Design a protein around this ligand. Sequence first.
Ligand SMILES: N#Cc1cccc(Cn2cc(NC(=O)c3n[nH]c4cc(-c5cn[nH]c5)ccc34)cn2)c1
Length: 239
Amino acid sequence: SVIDPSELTFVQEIGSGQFGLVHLGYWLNKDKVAIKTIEDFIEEAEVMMKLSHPKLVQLYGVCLEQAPICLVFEFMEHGCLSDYLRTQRGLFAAETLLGMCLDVCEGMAYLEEACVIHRDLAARNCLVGENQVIKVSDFGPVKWASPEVFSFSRYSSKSDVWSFGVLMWEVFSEGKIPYENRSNSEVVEDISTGFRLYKPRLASTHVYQIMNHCWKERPEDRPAFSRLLRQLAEIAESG
Ligand SMILES: N#Cc1cccc(Cn2cc(NC(=O)c3n[nH]c4cc(-c5cn[nH]c5)ccc34)cn2)c1
């Protein structure tokens, strides 16, 4: 990485050590960003900016001088996880897919500890960056929804855990559509009767056990992301 002089602007001398004189300066950086267009939202911005974790897409600031009002986010090199898995189907090792779930689980455990509830945890709301890293976006439909959410709209970290179970299935199936040829009412019928998404070939028996644990009827039966994180981190290290 070489910086062209145009980008640099000297300001004042800030003393000198033994080898060379040091100066204060401003470096004009032209960085890639993802810009999302549209009292009400100005409150949300500073709070979202306080939420900092390497496994969550970062909010850099909000631009609101005039309409369309827009949010400046961290750029994620390879787009949404759903499309990433779909176009790369067959090019995935079970370790890369597990590693993707662990990435999501890290950001989710932080959001759980911060008492922030995601309402749409799905592979489409997860993004791929440098060296296949996965980060969570759109934090603050029935296929990823837990019984309490499609029946009574009762959101919590445990409903986010259900969504994570569906996300894990999307990851290990390499971006396949959950309950593909079923409608919003058919999905509700099947889940209530106790049926769950099949074990994908790439997922081990232990990974599928974790998925079904995220898919328990009672939300208090489902494990916390803090519990899910320690478990997945062990499988990722031991193999
Ligand atoms: N240079 C270049 C270039 C040009 C075209 C396509 C791509 C590949 N690609 C990368 C993305 N990245 C993003 O979409 C993205 N990167 N950061 C994001 C944040 C949000 C977001 C939405 N709500 N909250 C966050 C949504 C989307 C993003 C999409 N396609 C890269």
